[PDB]
Design a protein around this ligand. Structure first.
Ligand code: VO4
Ligand code: VO4
Ligand SMILES: [Ca+2]
Ligand SMILES: [Ca+2]
Lengths: 590, 590
């Protein structure tokens, strides 16, 4: 047949394959319509559990008009630019200047404008590769009354309180008090001490975590993230630099060979420094109710974060939060791919032409080579993002962990002021009494530092970012969907079972890599899973994402990547497959 | 209709759109079968102008067995792994050790093995996005006897002879002798002084260059590649760093703000250093006939290049050659995109939601935002690479500039040894007289430095890389095709018309960025075209690609990107288009 018709039939075959996977229905937790206005004479939904950021809020963090959220959902579903623009974004605007009237003095003095919902209808966008954004689904988000939400927001609060704690010193006695406090608080929660019961949803059982120890504290559940040092090699260590190649019987050493152990990735002929910008230690955001409410009302606080001069390898929890703050979509995975290519980590042996050229007479760059994996790991990200945008906006609309912390803080302040509000987060408030007390101390210190001499007792989740979360619902996680997709691509493409001989950690005292005390072995698959978990949990340590968004959008991204790979496999005439170890421990051949 | 059915129909509509542009026939120059065996009693084609690298060669750089190249072509056209592996790659192997017997002492002492053709059938690979690898065409490559090839190889030889000369000092008196010699040599060539005649193919007229001046010496013909400093901003300058954002009426300044002018790109929360690894100055490769013939016989010299400690911003021509040596496929363009994003260069105003969020109520990250352009600029690369691989292997199979230099050198040595061979490059040998004399001086110096006390007079094209060119035909250029595709993506996505207020050059004396003396204005489109120019001509400055491969691969890549964008536009329900200034000077709306 003709080459043009052959290409058309290949594309139609890939589209038919995407069709044949079917559309997995997407089920929400029911919190959108479950919780109503606490007013005895108002039956409208409160939408407190829904992502209502941008829509005007009352002083308690609840929507003023549920019609605002209903129109927001209508705009999400329609996708029309005019209808999205017709949405009420932000608070009432000042008649004189046209600027929104902010509740906090900080946002008013800054003359902050509103920030819009980032791609409220990207889930309606179609894709020419991979599953449709709406074809694959995410399980229902944890409900606020669930012990899973309690454990999630507890992990978020402990991550916020431990943002200055260095990863290499999780086991160190200098952080022992806080680490043991967090471990014993999480292990005091039903979600961590009590196992899943028979009849729980498969996703609920699968994402349920066991006893929290120092070895898995603030860690993931993907295989290989809990094994070894906390941070992935690909986020801290560099790569074999230019000049360190093997030429026949002679091995040349790069004059810059120390850059591999200085956290410098050979980015072609230039270098990528793994060192992250140092966000100001101890500076948390949205710890005051007025600033938090302004952020809920779309206060564009983006870029307001202060940073220390220079850069360093990720050591503190805040360092990982900063890393996941600005990463260029596929940054972590593209960097992992660059490390694996420069380190000469072999591709999947089931790829063609991966032998020595004495045997196959064929090197691999465009297909089954460097360029192929570099392009796949980067193109999977936007389609996983479209899928997660569908999950965020059209299906779940889960409130951000900042919004949960706001509900929790208002609920905890209400008895102090004599009322009772947000009984939905009553379980969260009671089960995290000590965590919330530590958070209140931290928020008092921050609000004194912010400028309030006598700050109102605030139990808001401290935010690593001034704007807090990105302006979309928490469930699922875009960074974690890109994590799943890109790490899935890399594991399928590279020989993911290859063990990493040299395992590094960030030095506890200095800003350099040290050989990890980990006496076990780390695989490429294990460290890629660790990198995906690192980015995802770094989103958690920013206060912008719960753990379920993380893990279920990691699964969703893995599904998106599997679909993309399955469709692109129809385009290569070579006899081959991708040996892909999935996040459940199974290996699929694509 | 069903969302799954809508996704299927969108993908099938994109495939129909790709099918409807048609398959542009790909015409070769006829060089493959034009030149025959110089033997009086052998009528077989010599394939001297064909890419025969890897197949065994005689002492003159011609193929030993024409059936070898014919089987290579059959394997290219079939794509079968067994047929590719059955190809004879390299010279006769040693019966005892199994290692190939190399003509040069260097490759034998190094015990080099053969390196295989990289993706000899990647053009047979289909694409779910964009034009098919065989749907678009390049014009026939210039023939060896053409004055265009004479000008190309003269430019290559002058670039090799000028590899240690800094870009900021093209006009400087210290390099004035060489620059004027190159200008007068090129302007003495028919392709540069005589304009295109009526009846020439439109591609020849379009790619014909006029008078060579110091302002366009070793420059491109893309719009904006001739105005301003030689190097693009995006290949030398950094980007606005983390912390230098605008928050309402307050402008925060990054504590690392100097990194923008120190050649550091804000790569998320970590940094990309624009400084390139310093290749050894004056160390040229494949300057001896025996080493050149071994490289033609697939001597795997990859990684044999020596480098200086540290890194520097691209100053010398060898620096640009080194930069394009290892660049990770879309690295230049991804870096340009990262600079444009960090510098806050606005996207195309015709993209939706690009207004202030007070008006549209919608930020753009996944769609029409940072993630969208970052993913497009990287997925376009592999599609353009498949198209260019088709052009290289299945259509043109153009010999590399190293192979042209080998034919020229053998032709210029034959009268000195009383013989006559390769009258195809007779015009190049005659016209490149002074250039070939300087190249002979440089090659004799290098081969003395290599280890030959009295080296045979060699007129080979000096190569920046030990392996020389990659194992694919020169026409077209993979780096140039990725440049065209990705720079086209960036111009369509970003507001490419925005002028760059601050224009920088690498300091003539120091390794730092200095304000350019350029009193004109550089646009984003102009500097992106300049970046594609810089990558493509740095491939020329490596000795691995001619100028025609470069320009036509840039055009082809722009076609690839236009096709990909046209099919992506079928996936977005938003009312918008990409304002894309093509390399033609025209703007298409996608
Ligand atoms: O959706 V996210 O803030 O990773
Ligand atoms: O095709 V290339 O060596 O740029
Ligand atoms: Ca191979
Ligand atoms: Ca906007």
């Amino acid at each position: 047949q003709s080459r043009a018709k052959a290409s058309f039939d290949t594309r139609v075959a890939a589209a038919e394959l995407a069709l044949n996977r079917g559309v997995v229905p997407s089920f929400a937790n029911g919190e959108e319509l479950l919780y109503r206005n606490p007013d005895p004479d108002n039956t409208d939904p409160s939408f407190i559990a829904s992502f209502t950021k941008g829509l005007p809020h009352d002083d308690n963090g609840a929507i003023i008009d549920p019609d605002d959220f209903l129109a927001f959902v209508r705009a999400i579903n329609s996708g029309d630019e005019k209808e999205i623009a017709d949405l009420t974004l932000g608070p009432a605007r000042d008649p004189e200047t046209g600027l929104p009237i902010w509740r906090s003095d900080l946002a008013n003095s800054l003359e902050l404008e509103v920030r819009g919902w980032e791609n409220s209808s990207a889930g309606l966008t179609f894709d020419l590769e991979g599953p449709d954004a709406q074809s694959i689904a995410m399980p229902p988000a944890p409900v606020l009354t669930s012990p899973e939400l309690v454990a999630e927001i507890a992990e978020l609060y402990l991550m916020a309180l431990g943002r200055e704690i260095e990863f290499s010193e999780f086991d160190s006695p200098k952080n022992a008090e806080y680490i043991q406090f967090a471990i014993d608080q999480l292990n005091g929660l039903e979600w961590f001490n009590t196992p899943a019961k028979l009849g729980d949803p498969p996703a609920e059982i699968r994402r349920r975590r066991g006893e929290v120890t120092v070895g898995n504290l603030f860690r993931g559940i993907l295989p290989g993230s809990e094994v070894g040092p906390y941070l992935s090699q690909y986020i801290i260590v560099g790569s074999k630099q230019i000049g360190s190649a093997t030429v026949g019987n002679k091995t040349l050493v790069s004059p810059n060979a120390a850059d591999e152990f200085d956290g410098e990735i050979a980015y072609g002929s230039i270098t990528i420094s793994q060192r992250v910008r140092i966000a100001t230690p101890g500076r948390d955001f949205m710890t005051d109710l007025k600033v938090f409410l302004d952020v809920q009302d779309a206060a564009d606080f983006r870029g307001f974060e202060s940073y220390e001069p220079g850069a360093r390898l990720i050591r503190t929890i805040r360092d990982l939060a900063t890393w996941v703050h600005f990463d260029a979509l596929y940054e972590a995975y593209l960097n992992a791919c660059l490390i694996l290519l420069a380190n000469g980590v072999p591709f999947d042996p089931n790829l063609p032409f991966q032998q020595e050229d004495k045997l196959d007479n064929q090197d691999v760059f465009v297909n089954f080579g460097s360029a192929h994996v570099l392009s796949l790991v980067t193109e999977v990200a936007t389609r996983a993002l479209k899928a997660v945008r569908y999950q965020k906006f059209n299906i779940h609309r889960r409130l951000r962990p900042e919004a949960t912390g706001g509900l929790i803080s208002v609920n905890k302040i209400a008895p102090q002021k004599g009322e009772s509000i947000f009984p939905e987060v009553d379980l969260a408030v009671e089960e995290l009494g000590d965590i919330l007390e530590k958070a209140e101390i931290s928020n008092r210190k921050q609000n004194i530092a912010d400028g309030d001499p006598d700050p109102d007792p605030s139990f808001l989740l401290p935010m690593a970012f001034a704007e807090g979360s990105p302006f979309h619902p928490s469930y699922g996680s875009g960074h974690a969907v890109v994590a799943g997709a890109c790490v899935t691509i890399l594991k399928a493409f590279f020989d993911s079972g290859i063990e990493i001989d040299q395992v590094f950690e960030v030095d506890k005292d200095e800003d350099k890599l040290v050989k990890s005390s980990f006496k076990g072995t780390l695989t490429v698959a294990g460290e890629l899973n660790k990198l995906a978990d690192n980015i995802a949990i770094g989103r958690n340590m920013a206060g912008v994402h719960y753990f379920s968004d993380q893990f279920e959008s990691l699964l969703l991204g893995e599904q998106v990547a599997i679909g993309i790979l399955e469709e692109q496999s129809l385009t290569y005439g070579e006899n081959f497959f991708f040996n892909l170890p999935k996040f459940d421990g199974t290996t699929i051949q694509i």
